[PDB]
Write a protein that binds this ligand. Structure first.
Ligand SMILES: [Co+2]
Ligand SMILES: [Co+2]
Ligand SMILES: [Co+2]
Length: 448
């Protein structure tokens, strides 16, 4: 009487298979879900239940599309459609492996990374350490990561958030990259006191240097020029506090305090990246807006759907969101080259010189954010999220890379420190090499 729908498969943008079903026998005939790559992208793909329906991940959230509908006799069986992801399996495999050995080397609790296509915001790689293997029983893997923290697990971004302040002061004509400023070692603002992570008297930092050296005081002084209302607007336009609509189960919206609810001290914390939370995808999505000449395209992981006959429907593209002008975006890309610039005399070195790749205009921002102590309701003093986000390249944006490390003891390469910059170096460099992309004057971060 019953005519079974054949489960559709999940494939990457080039039709490389991630999940597919084959026929077998045992309740006599029995279909088997194959995952040829094992843990590859299984944070996204998910896994199967005993009945052959989705258990978690996209297998679950797109089950209706993938399972089809059983026929009868007369009602035709509707076989499952094939789901085409924006993932590139080669990029995903490299990134997923590098994320695991950044976790091993740095001693972090966990590590995640997102690679977006610069122009479309398509998700080319999304990875966390400790990924489960859906070709194996779920009950054996309680020590594994079974979900997708890159979309589900918000954190406070720290100084990586300073892209919002940089974007607002340039977009509103309030400063320029070469403006020589006067930055004291500390400021009192909205009832509180904010220090730079190093002691110093008044320094002649350029606006470029404020972001290249990651001066909190400099950032807040420039943010005073913007004001809370224009700053909050830009937060919202960069997409923070809102789900992206990426097409993955369990996405978190993050948290941005509405302006009508700020305390006297909110404006002293938000521009430097404390007092708000975002997912790794939102964070990378911010840098995609600047990479795409100021036009934010919400990220997407589903590329198209293929019906059982073989006809393909592309996923509808989300609408553009103009965050800043193309002129603003290009100026911010160039300023962020200062973060990766080297200077043996020290004066003109950014915070992330190991993130630079010689021959390329790499641009990015380093981050360190205190986590909240569960037992006191107050910040830990030596527990941090380490963040990095960057663009390959500033003059030719192709890839946007976002990284977070949960409280590492060392760099992502295993050297002393607490920086995600070497992980960005590895990934962005490998992306340039494999596409055979071929190879000006130093930026001024500090006047005299
Ligand atoms: Co009927
Ligand atoms: Co240390
Ligand atoms: Co290298």
């Amino acid at each position: 009487d019953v005519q079974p729908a054949a489960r559709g498969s999940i494939v990457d943008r080039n039709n490389d298979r991630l999940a597919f079903t084959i026929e077998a026998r045992a309740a006599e005939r029995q279909d088997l879900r194959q995952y040829p790559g094992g843990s590859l992208a299984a944070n996204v793909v998910g896994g199967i239940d005993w009945d052959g329906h989705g258990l978690l991940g996209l297998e679950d959230s797109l089950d209706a599309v993938l399972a089809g509908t059983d026929g009868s006799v007369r009602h035709k069986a509707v076989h499952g459609s094939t789901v085409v992801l924006t993932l590139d399996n080669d990029i995903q495999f490299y990134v997923q492996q590098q994320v695991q050995q950044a976790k091993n080397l740095s001693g972090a609790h966990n590590v995640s990374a997102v690679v977006l296509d610069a122009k479309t915001g398509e998700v080319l790689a999304m990875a966390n350490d400790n990924t489960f293997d859906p070709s194996q029983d779920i009950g054996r893997q309680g020590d594994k990561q079974l979900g997708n923290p890159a979309v589900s697990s918000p954190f406070e971004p720290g100084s990586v958030n300073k892209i919002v302040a940089a974007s607002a002061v340039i977009e509103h004509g309030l400063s320029s990259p070469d403006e020589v400023l006067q930055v004291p070692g500390s400021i009192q603002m909205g009832g509180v006191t904010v220090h730079d992570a190093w002691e110093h008297g008044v320094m002649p930092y350029t606006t470029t240097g404020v972001f290249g050296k990651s001066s909190n005081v400099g950032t807040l002084m420039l943010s005073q020029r913007v004001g809370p209302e224009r700053y909050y607007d830009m937060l919202r336009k960069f997409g923070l506090g809102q789900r992206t609509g990426v097409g993955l189960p369990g996405e978190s919206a993050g948290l941005v305090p509405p302006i009508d609810q700020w305390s006297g001290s909110t404006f002293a914390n938000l521009p430097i990246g404390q007092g708000l939370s975002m997912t790794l995808l939102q964070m990378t999505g911010m840098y995609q807006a600047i990479a795409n000449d100021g036009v934010r395209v919400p990220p997407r992981i589903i590329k198209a759907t293929v019906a059982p006959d073989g006809s393909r429907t592309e996923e509808p593209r989300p609408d553009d969101i103009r965050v800043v002008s193309a002129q603003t975006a290009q100026t911010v890309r160039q300023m962020l080259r200062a973060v990766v610039q080297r200077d043996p005399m020290g004066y003109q070195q950014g915070t992330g010189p190991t993130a630079g790749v010689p021959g390329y205009q790499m641009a990015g921002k380093t981050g360190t954010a205190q986590q909240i102590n569960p037992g006191c309701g107050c910040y830990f003093d030596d527990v941090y999220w380490i963040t990095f986000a960057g663009i390959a390249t500033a003059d030719n944006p192709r890839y946007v890379i976002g990284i977070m490390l949960d409280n590492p003891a060392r760099n992502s390469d295993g050297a002393p420190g607490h920086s995600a910059a070497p992980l960005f170096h590895n990934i962005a460099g490998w992306l340039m090499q494999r596409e055979n992309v071929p190879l000006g004057p130093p930026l001024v971060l500090q006047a005299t």
